[PDB]
Amino acid sequence: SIDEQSLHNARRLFESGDIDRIEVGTTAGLQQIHRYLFGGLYDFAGQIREDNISKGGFRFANAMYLKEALVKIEQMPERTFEEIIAKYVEMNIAHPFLEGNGRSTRIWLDLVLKKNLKKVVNWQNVSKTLYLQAMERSPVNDLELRFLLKDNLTDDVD
Amino acid sequence: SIDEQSLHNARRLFESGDIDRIEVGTTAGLQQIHRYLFGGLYDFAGQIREDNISKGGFRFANAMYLKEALVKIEQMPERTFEEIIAKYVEMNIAHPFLEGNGRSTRIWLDLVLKKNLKKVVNWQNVSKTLYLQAMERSPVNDLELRFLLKDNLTDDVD
Ligand SMILES: Nc1ncnc2c1ncn2[C@@H]1O[C@H](COP(=O)(O)OP(=O)(O)NP(=O)(O)O)[C@@H](O)[C@H]1O
């Protein structure tokens, strides 16, 4: 029931206009989103992880320098589509939470895209399978991800 | 001639007993080794890289938080074989130089093993192919590496 309740919570962030009070493009901002989605569901909601984690043969940033990584990641520029995806890709590698990084950082991405390009990702039309592939490859090369997301943008941001 | 001269330079470090002045298990120590091996061969000899690099579908620690990562990596403990390989594995992910990380960090590893376990890796008997595989997998899981290196130790350290 967690996946369900976290979705309802995401549904509520926008419907309530609380999304508009989230800090855009910062670590603190990502933590806000995560806290709001998973508050009361995961007891680590909003908290940077202590432990190391890996998935599908990738290891995310070592917990021991995760906080330091995040300090630099949030400072990355958001001027162009390419720069925003670059930032998104790094924040993914950072993977600051034990769980729920995906939903939360996607929202995080959309807010950056909205602020700087007046656009958001039309996730309806994005294949979950292809997205996951693109992300898996992203650290070595973000071509697949850019190609996937660029023609799935929409300026219909509300 | 890089790879052969750098080899000659590695011979010297030991034959001259200069190896014994290298700081053991620290970032500075690794820089010393690199500087000794590649001094006058690479103009970045001994220097932490500013640029990002990747190999065989792995991307090494982002240049932007590489210095911070190193500060934490050098502090890792060296009491047991498992802990030493753990440290070695992290320093590999860090991959602080544009080139020459392999030769230099292996020497770095041997010094740590020597100090703490009174043993070194008998690289003669270590398959290059298998080592490279083990390393490639090491961030996700260091089993292959430990298995490879444990029964290739020698207490005949000089
Ligand atoms: N092998 C991989 N390499 C890099 N990134 C990955 C990999 N696998 C997954 N990811 C990213 O991390 C996210 C999954 O992280 P996780 O913290 O499990 O979020 P989640 O909400 O539990 N699952 P999901 O809703 O499917 O994203 C995915 O959406 C990808 O963006």
Ligand SMILES: Nc1ncnc2c1ncn2[C@@H]1O[C@H](COP(=O)(O)OP(=O)(O)NP(=O)(O)O)[C@@H](O)[C@H]1O
């Ligand atoms: N795909 C990979 N993923 C993780 N680590 C790797 C990968 N490929 C190589 N390595 C490690 O990085 C080392 C080589 O890094 P590099 O910067 O090329 O140094 P090098 O000294 O030029 N090569 P070598 O002399 O063979 O060790 C290898 O010895 C491995 O320990």
